[PDB]
Amino acid sequence: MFKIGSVLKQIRQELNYHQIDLYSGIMSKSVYIKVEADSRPISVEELSKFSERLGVNFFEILNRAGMNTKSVNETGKEKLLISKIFTNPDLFDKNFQRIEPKRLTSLQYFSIYLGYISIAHHYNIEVPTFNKTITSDLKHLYDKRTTFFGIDYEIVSNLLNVLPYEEVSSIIKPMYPIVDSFGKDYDLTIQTVLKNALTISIMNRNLKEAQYYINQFEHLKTIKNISINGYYDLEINYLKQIYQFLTDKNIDSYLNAVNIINIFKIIGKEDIHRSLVEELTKISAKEKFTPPKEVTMYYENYVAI
Protein backbone atom coordinates (compact mmCIF):
# COMPACT_ATOMS: atom_id res chain seq x y z
CA MET A 1 0.00 0.00 0.00
CA PHE A 2 1.38 3.37 1.10
CA LYS A 3 5.09 3.69 1.87
CA ILE A 4 4.88 4.02 5.65
CA GLY A 5 8.44 2.69 5.71
CA SER A 6 10.16 5.44 3.75
CA VAL A 7 8.39 7.96 5.99
CA LEU A 8 9.71 6.25 9.12
CA LYS A 9 13.28 6.41 7.82
CA GLN A 10 12.72 10.02 6.78
CA ILE A 11 11.58 11.10 10.24
CA ARG A 12 14.21 9.00 12.03
CA GLN A 13 17.08 10.50 10.04
CA GLU A 14 15.76 14.06 10.22
CA LEU A 15 15.65 13.72 14.01
CA ASN A 16 19.01 11.94 13.92
CA TYR A 17 17.91 8.64 15.48
CA HIS A 18 19.65 5.33 14.82
CA GLN A 19 17.79 2.15 13.86
CA ILE A 20 18.73 0.68 17.24
CA ASP A 21 16.74 3.54 18.79
CA LEU A 22 13.50 2.33 17.22
CA TYR A 23 13.46 -1.48 16.99
CA SER A 24 15.21 -2.01 20.33
CA GLY A 25 12.59 -3.97 22.23
CA ILE A 26 10.15 -4.11 19.31
CA MET A 27 11.77 -6.26 16.61
CA SER A 28 14.99 -7.61 15.11
CA LYS A 29 17.29 -5.27 13.18
CA SER A 30 16.80 -7.70 10.29
CA VAL A 31 13.05 -7.32 9.79
CA TYR A 32 13.06 -3.62 10.69
CA ILE A 33 15.15 -2.91 7.60
CA LYS A 34 12.39 -4.68 5.67
CA VAL A 35 9.65 -2.53 7.20
CA GLU A 36 11.60 0.66 6.55
CA ALA A 37 12.42 -0.58 3.05
CA ASP A 38 8.68 -1.03 2.55
CA SER A 39 8.98 -4.74 1.81
CA ARG A 40 7.21 -5.97 4.94
CA PRO A 41 3.71 -4.91 6.04
CA ILE A 42 3.74 -2.92 9.29
CA SER A 43 1.12 -3.53 11.98
CA VAL A 44 -0.77 -0.74 13.72
CA GLU A 45 0.60 -1.93 17.06
CA GLU A 46 4.14 -1.53 15.75
CA LEU A 47 3.76 1.80 13.95
CA SER A 48 2.20 3.12 17.15
CA LYS A 49 5.33 2.17 19.09
CA PHE A 50 7.68 3.67 16.51
CA SER A 51 5.49 6.77 16.64
CA GLU A 52 6.37 7.12 20.33
CA ARG A 53 10.07 6.47 19.70
CA LEU A 54 10.22 9.20 17.06
CA GLY A 55 8.09 11.65 19.02
CA VAL A 56 6.09 12.56 15.92
CA ASN A 57 2.29 12.29 15.89
CA PHE A 58 0.97 8.87 14.87
CA PHE A 59 -1.75 10.22 12.58
CA GLU A 60 0.70 12.72 11.11
CA ILE A 61 2.99 9.85 10.14
CA LEU A 62 0.09 8.14 8.37
CA ASN A 63 -0.78 11.40 6.61
CA ARG A 64 2.81 11.82 5.43
CA ALA A 65 2.68 8.25 4.16
CA GLY A 66 -0.23 9.09 1.88
CA MET A 67 -3.25 8.66 4.16
CA ASN A 68 -3.82 12.20 2.90
CA THR A 69 -6.84 10.45 1.39
CA LYS A 70 -9.94 12.02 -0.13
CA SER A 71 -8.12 11.31 -3.39
CA VAL A 72 -5.83 8.30 -2.96
CA ASN A 73 -8.98 6.28 -2.32
CA GLU A 74 -11.52 5.24 -4.95
CA THR A 75 -14.48 6.85 -3.19
CA GLY A 76 -12.26 9.77 -2.23
CA LYS A 77 -11.72 10.75 -5.87
CA GLU A 78 -15.45 10.44 -6.50
CA LYS A 79 -16.15 12.98 -3.77
CA LEU A 80 -13.63 15.53 -5.04
CA LEU A 81 -15.09 14.96 -8.49
CA ILE A 82 -18.51 16.06 -7.23
CA SER A 83 -17.04 19.53 -6.72
CA LYS A 84 -15.81 19.47 -10.31
CA ILE A 85 -19.13 18.53 -11.89
CA PHE A 86 -20.72 21.34 -9.87
CA THR A 87 -18.60 23.69 -11.98
CA ASN A 88 -18.90 21.65 -15.18
CA PRO A 89 -22.47 20.20 -15.30
CA ASP A 90 -21.73 18.80 -18.76
CA LEU A 91 -19.87 16.03 -16.93
CA PHE A 92 -22.94 14.92 -14.99
CA ASP A 93 -24.58 12.52 -17.44
CA LYS A 94 -21.63 10.16 -17.93
CA ASN A 95 -20.47 10.07 -14.30
CA PHE A 96 -23.93 9.73 -12.73
CA GLN A 97 -24.73 6.72 -14.91
CA ARG A 98 -21.63 5.25 -13.31
CA ILE A 99 -22.31 6.01 -9.63
CA GLU A 100 -26.10 5.63 -9.57
CA PRO A 101 -26.05 1.81 -9.97
CA LYS A 102 -23.50 1.36 -7.17
CA ARG A 103 -25.12 3.75 -4.71
CA LEU A 104 -25.91 0.98 -2.22
CA THR A 105 -22.53 -0.74 -2.43
CA SER A 106 -21.32 1.16 0.63
CA LEU A 107 -22.32 4.09 2.84
CA GLN A 108 -19.55 6.01 1.09
CA TYR A 109 -21.05 5.50 -2.36
CA PHE A 110 -24.53 6.44 -1.15
CA SER A 111 -23.25 9.80 0.10
CA ILE A 112 -21.59 10.28 -3.28
CA TYR A 113 -24.90 9.41 -4.93
CA LEU A 114 -26.71 12.07 -2.89
CA GLY A 115 -24.05 14.56 -3.90
CA TYR A 116 -24.92 13.99 -7.56
CA ILE A 117 -28.66 14.37 -6.93
CA SER A 118 -27.82 17.83 -5.58
CA ILE A 119 -26.07 18.69 -8.85
CA ALA A 120 -29.06 17.46 -10.85
CA HIS A 121 -31.45 19.50 -8.71
CA HIS A 122 -29.26 22.59 -8.96
CA TYR A 123 -29.08 22.35 -12.75
CA ASN A 124 -32.69 21.20 -13.07
CA ILE A 125 -31.31 18.01 -14.61
CA GLU A 126 -33.84 15.18 -14.57
CA VAL A 127 -33.36 12.24 -12.22
CA PRO A 128 -36.63 10.22 -12.26
CA THR A 129 -34.92 7.23 -10.65
CA PHE A 130 -34.41 9.23 -7.45
CA ASN A 131 -38.00 9.85 -6.32
CA LYS A 132 -38.71 6.19 -7.11
CA THR A 133 -35.85 4.84 -4.99
CA ILE A 134 -34.90 7.03 -2.00
CA THR A 135 -37.63 5.79 0.34
CA SER A 136 -36.62 2.17 -0.26
CA ASP A 137 -32.93 3.11 -0.20
CA LEU A 138 -33.31 4.80 3.17
CA LYS A 139 -35.39 1.91 4.48
CA HIS A 140 -32.73 -0.53 3.29
CA LEU A 141 -29.93 1.53 4.87
CA TYR A 142 -31.26 2.51 8.31
CA ASP A 143 -34.34 0.40 9.12
CA LYS A 144 -32.26 -1.87 11.36
CA ARG A 145 -29.48 0.46 12.53
CA THR A 146 -28.25 0.83 16.11
CA THR A 147 -25.06 2.90 16.18
CA PHE A 148 -24.06 5.53 13.65
CA PHE A 149 -20.69 6.46 12.18
CA GLY A 150 -19.36 9.67 10.69
CA ILE A 151 -20.38 8.68 7.16
CA ASP A 152 -23.96 8.29 8.39
CA TYR A 153 -24.11 11.87 9.62
CA GLU A 154 -22.55 12.87 6.30
CA ILE A 155 -25.28 11.02 4.41
CA VAL A 156 -28.06 12.57 6.48
CA SER A 157 -26.37 15.95 6.10
CA ASN A 158 -26.40 15.72 2.30
CA LEU A 159 -29.82 14.07 2.37
CA LEU A 160 -31.38 17.16 3.94
CA ASN A 161 -30.43 19.10 0.81
CA VAL A 162 -32.31 16.83 -1.61
CA LEU A 163 -35.26 15.54 0.41
CA PRO A 164 -38.09 17.29 2.31
CA TYR A 165 -37.42 17.59 6.05
CA GLU A 166 -40.56 15.62 6.95
CA GLU A 167 -38.95 12.54 5.38
CA VAL A 168 -35.43 12.89 6.81
CA SER A 169 -36.75 13.94 10.22
CA SER A 170 -37.24 10.40 11.56
CA ILE A 171 -33.76 9.30 10.45
CA ILE A 172 -32.09 12.08 12.44
CA LYS A 173 -33.61 11.73 15.92
CA PRO A 174 -32.03 8.32 16.68
CA MET A 175 -28.60 9.72 15.83
CA TYR A 176 -28.68 12.18 18.74
CA PRO A 177 -27.70 13.14 21.31
CA ILE A 178 -23.99 12.53 20.78
CA VAL A 179 -22.02 11.15 23.72
CA ASP A 180 -18.41 10.85 22.53
CA SER A 181 -16.00 12.07 19.85
CA PHE A 182 -14.43 9.74 17.28
CA GLY A 183 -12.09 12.02 15.35
CA LYS A 184 -12.28 15.54 13.93
CA ASP A 185 -13.91 14.37 10.70
CA TYR A 186 -16.62 12.76 12.82
CA ASP A 187 -17.09 15.95 14.83
CA LEU A 188 -17.36 17.85 11.56
CA THR A 189 -20.23 15.82 10.12
CA ILE A 190 -22.24 15.54 13.34
CA GLN A 191 -22.16 19.33 13.55
CA THR A 192 -23.19 19.72 9.91
CA VAL A 193 -26.41 17.76 10.42
CA LEU A 194 -27.43 20.11 13.23
CA LYS A 195 -26.43 23.20 11.26
CA ASN A 196 -28.36 22.11 8.15
CA ALA A 197 -31.37 20.97 10.19
CA LEU A 198 -31.48 24.15 12.26
CA THR A 199 -31.46 26.13 9.02
CA ILE A 200 -34.35 24.27 7.43
CA SER A 201 -36.21 24.41 10.75
CA ILE A 202 -35.88 28.17 11.21
CA MET A 203 -36.64 28.69 7.51
CA ASN A 204 -39.89 26.71 7.50
CA ARG A 205 -40.71 28.26 10.88
CA ASN A 206 -40.70 24.96 12.79
CA LEU A 207 -39.59 26.67 15.99
CA LYS A 208 -39.93 23.54 18.12
CA GLU A 209 -37.57 21.61 15.85
CA ALA A 210 -35.23 24.59 15.72
CA GLN A 211 -34.93 24.63 19.52
CA TYR A 212 -34.16 20.90 19.54
CA TYR A 213 -31.20 21.42 17.22
CA ILE A 214 -29.94 24.50 19.04
CA ASN A 215 -29.93 22.34 22.17
CA GLN A 216 -28.18 19.43 20.46
CA PHE A 217 -25.36 21.68 19.29
CA GLU A 218 -25.08 23.20 22.76
CA HIS A 219 -24.85 19.67 24.12
CA LEU A 220 -21.81 18.99 21.95
CA LYS A 221 -20.01 21.80 23.74
CA THR A 222 -20.21 19.79 26.97
CA ILE A 223 -18.44 16.80 25.47
CA LYS A 224 -14.73 17.56 25.78
CA ASN A 225 -12.92 16.06 22.76
CA ILE A 226 -15.65 16.98 20.28
CA SER A 227 -13.73 19.99 18.97
CA ILE A 228 -16.35 22.41 17.63
CA ASN A 229 -16.08 24.09 14.23
CA GLY A 230 -15.50 27.82 14.69
CA TYR A 231 -17.30 28.75 11.48
CA TYR A 232 -20.25 26.56 12.46
CA ASP A 233 -20.34 28.12 15.92
CA LEU A 234 -20.74 31.50 14.23
CA GLU A 235 -23.32 30.36 11.69
CA ILE A 236 -25.31 28.32 14.22
CA ASN A 237 -25.32 31.25 16.65
CA TYR A 238 -26.69 33.58 13.98
CA LEU A 239 -29.53 31.11 13.47
CA LYS A 240 -29.87 30.97 17.25
CA GLN A 241 -30.23 34.75 17.20
CA ILE A 242 -32.82 34.66 14.42
CA TYR A 243 -34.67 32.00 16.40
CA GLN A 244 -34.88 34.27 19.45
CA PHE A 245 -35.97 37.17 17.26
CA LEU A 246 -38.87 35.10 15.91
CA THR A 247 -40.02 34.37 19.46
CA ASP A 248 -38.96 36.89 22.12
CA LYS A 249 -39.26 39.44 19.29
CA ASN A 250 -36.39 41.78 20.21
CA ILE A 251 -34.64 43.85 17.55
CA ASP A 252 -31.42 43.17 19.46
CA SER A 253 -31.56 39.50 18.48
CA TYR A 254 -31.99 40.44 14.82
CA LEU A 255 -29.17 42.99 14.96
CA ASN A 256 -26.92 40.31 16.44
CA ALA A 257 -27.79 37.97 13.58
CA VAL A 258 -26.80 40.69 11.12
CA ASN A 259 -23.62 41.47 13.04
CA ILE A 260 -22.58 37.82 12.93
CA ILE A 261 -23.33 37.54 9.20
CA ASN A 262 -21.23 40.67 8.67
CA ILE A 263 -18.20 39.28 10.53
CA PHE A 264 -18.01 36.60 7.83
CA LYS A 265 -17.40 39.36 5.29
CA ILE A 266 -14.91 41.22 7.48
CA ILE A 267 -12.71 38.11 7.67
CA GLY A 268 -12.58 37.29 3.96
CA LYS A 269 -15.27 34.62 3.82
CA GLU A 270 -16.86 36.46 0.88
CA ASP A 271 -18.49 33.38 -0.67
CA ILE A 272 -20.04 32.08 2.55
CA HIS A 273 -21.08 35.62 3.48
CA ARG A 274 -22.96 36.16 0.23
CA SER A 275 -24.81 32.90 0.83
CA LEU A 276 -25.64 33.93 4.40
CA VAL A 277 -27.07 37.26 3.25
CA GLU A 278 -29.19 35.50 0.63
CA GLU A 279 -30.49 33.34 3.48
CA LEU A 280 -31.35 36.16 5.88
CA THR A 281 -33.34 37.76 3.06
CA LYS A 282 -35.51 34.67 2.61
CA ILE A 283 -36.15 34.15 6.34
CA SER A 284 -37.24 37.78 6.64
CA ALA A 285 -39.82 37.06 3.93
CA LYS A 286 -41.04 33.80 5.50
CA GLU A 287 -39.86 31.71 2.54
CA LYS A 288 -39.64 27.95 3.13
CA PHE A 289 -36.41 26.06 2.49
CA THR A 290 -35.64 25.56 -1.20
CA PRO A 291 -32.21 24.70 -2.64
CA PRO A 292 -30.69 28.15 -3.31
CA LYS A 293 -28.45 29.22 -6.19
CA GLU A 294 -25.55 29.44 -3.74
CA VAL A 295 -24.36 25.92 -2.95
CA THR A 296 -22.10 25.64 0.09
CA MET A 297 -19.90 22.62 0.75
CA TYR A 298 -17.37 21.39 3.28
CA TYR A 299 -14.31 19.29 2.53
CA GLU A 300 -11.34 20.66 4.42
CA ASN A 301 -12.95 24.10 4.53
CA TYR A 302 -16.27 25.95 4.30
CA VAL A 303 -16.61 26.96 0.66
CA ALA A 304 -19.15 27.98 -1.97
CA ILE A 305 -19.47 27.22 -5.68
Partner 1 sequence: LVTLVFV
> Which of these ranges, 72-80, 90-98, 123-131, 285-293, lies near its own copies under the rule CB under 8 A?
72-80
Determine the Cα–Cα distance for residues 244 and 258; give it in Å rounded to an integer: 13
Report the site for partner 1 in 169-228 (rule: CB under 8 A).
185, 188-189, 192, 195-196, 199-200
Minimum distance from residue 4 beta carbon to its own copies (Å): 6
Among 19, 31, 52, 286, binds its own copies (CB under 8 A): 52
Residue 78 and residue 112 in contact, taking contact as beta carbons nearer than 8 Å: yes
221: β partners: none
> Does 275 contact partner 1 by CB under 8 A?
yes
Determine the Cα–Cα distance for residues 305 and 297; give it in Å rounded to an integer: 8
Residue with smaller CB distance to partner 1, 6 or 69? 69
Residue with smaller CB distance to its own copies, 92 or 298? 298
Among 161, 204, 216, 256, binds partner 1 (CB under 8 A): 161
Residue 175 and residue 144 in contact, taking contact as beta carbons nearer than 8 Å: no
Report the site for partner 1 in 38-67 (rule: CB under 8 A).
57
Question: How crowded is residue 219: how many other Cβ atoms within 10 Å of its Cβ?
Answer: 15
Residue with smaller CB distance to its own copies, 172 or 226? 226
Q: One symbol per residue from 198 to 237: x for binding its own copies (CB under 8 A), - otherwise; what is it? A: -----------------------x--xxxxxxxxxxx--x
Residue 78 and residue 41 in contact, taking contact as beta carbons nearer than 8 Å: no
> Does 299 contact partner 1 by CB under 8 A?
yes
Q: Is the peptide bond before 291 cis (omega within 30 degrees of 0)?
A: no
> Does 17 contact partner 1 by CB under 8 A?
no
Minimum distance from residue 137 beta carbon to its own copies (Å): 14
Determine the Cα–Cα distance for residues 249 and 260; give it in Å rounded to an integer: 18
Size of the site for its own copies (CB under 8 A): 79
Residue with smaller CB distance to its own copies, 25 or 268? 268
Of residues 7, 103, 95, the one with CA closest to residue 51 = 7
Residue 128 interaction partner, one of its own copies, partner 1, none, beta carbon < 5-8 Å per kind: none
- Which residues are CB-neighbours of 233 under 8 A, at least 6 positions away? none
303: β partners: 297
Report the site for its own copies in 260-289 (rule: CB under 8 A).
260, 262-263, 266-269
- Which residues are CB-neighbours of 199 under 8 A, at least 6 positions away? 239, 279, 289
> Does 145 contact its own copies by CB under 8 A?
yes
Side-chain half-sphere CA neighbours of 26 within 13 A? 23
Minimum distance from residue 40 beta carbon to partner 1 (Å): 29
Which DSSP helix (H) or strand (E) runs through 241? helix 230-247
> Does 158 contact partner 1 by CB under 8 A?
yes
Q: Is 71 helix (H, G, I), strand (E, B) or coil?
A: coil
Residue 97 interaction partner, one of partner 1, its own copies, none, beta carbon < 5-8 Å per kind: none
Query: What are the CA-CA distances from residue 79 to residues 133, 206, 209 (Å)?
Result: 21, 32, 30
> Does 28 contact its own copies by CB under 8 A?
no
Binding site for partner 1 (CB under 8 A): 57, 69-70, 79-80, 82-83, 111, 115, 118, 150-151, 153-154, 157-158, 160-161, 185, 188-189, 192, 195-196, 199-200, 235, 272, 275-276, 279, 289, 291-292, 294-299, 302
